[PDB]
């Protein structure tokens, strides 16, 4: 199977919140998102499928600038990131998110995807 299919399938049945971004396309576009991520954020899959893995569409007033920078650098340098950051749902409700990005490499050791997952840690 392809990397996109293979990675998504790994999480079947876990009800995880995650997206897959295409690292070989400008802007690192989201090319897949789980049902859990749809429910978490309040955005439809259709809306999410026109957004970037940086998850800029989740930024709001209290989203720290330094956190936005960390995310940009992670994606730009194609490196891992584990970050506690305030994100905003579709209707504006804020939530604390543990944002986890890992670069996915192919058989040639080239980064072809980003796996980015989201844990609601507002608790």
Numbering used by the authors: 12 to 134
Give passages from the manuscript.
The KCNH family of voltage gated potassium channels includes the EAG (ether-a-go-go) channels, the ERG (eag related gene) channels and the ELK (eag like K+) channels; these channels have roles in cardiac repolarization, neuronal excitability, cell differentiation and tumor growth. A defining characteristic of KCNH channels is their large N- and C-terminal cytoplasmic regions. The N-terminus typically includes a Per-Arnt-Sim (PAS) domain, while the C-terminal region includes a domain that strongly resembles cyclic nucleotide binding domains, but which has been shown to have little affinity for cyclic nucleotides. As already stated, the role of PAS domains in KCNH channels is unknown; it is not known if these domains bind small ligands or mediate interactions between the channel and other proteins.
Crystals of dELK PAS domain were obtained after applying a strategy that involves methylation of lysines and removal of the first 10 amino acids of the protein. In the dELK PAS domain crystals, the asymmetric unit contains two very similar copies (rmsd 0.4 Å for main chain atoms of all residues). Analysis of the two dELK structures in the asymmetric unit reveals the absence of a large cavity. The lack of a preformed cavity in the dELK domain, at the same site as in hERG, appears to result from the presence of several large side-chains in that region. A large part of the volume is occupied by the side-chain of F110 in dELK, which substitutes the smaller valine residue present in hERG (V110). In dELK a histidine (H129) replaces the cavity lining phenylalanine present in hERG (F129). The absence of a cavity in dELK leaves the histidine side-chain buried in the domain hydrophobic core surrounded, within 5 Å, by the side-chains of several apolar residues (V30, F48, L51, L69,F98, F110 and A127) and two cysteines (C66 and C108). In contrast, in dELK the hydrophobic patch is not involved in crystal lattice packing. Instead part of the domain N-terminus forms an amphipathic α-helix (residues 14 to 21) which packs its apolar face against the hydrophobic patch on the surface of the β-sheet. Interestingly, a superposition of the dELK structure with the Δ9-hERG PAS domain through residues in their β-sheet reveals that the N-terminal helices occupy the same relative positions at the center of the hydrophobic patch of each domain.
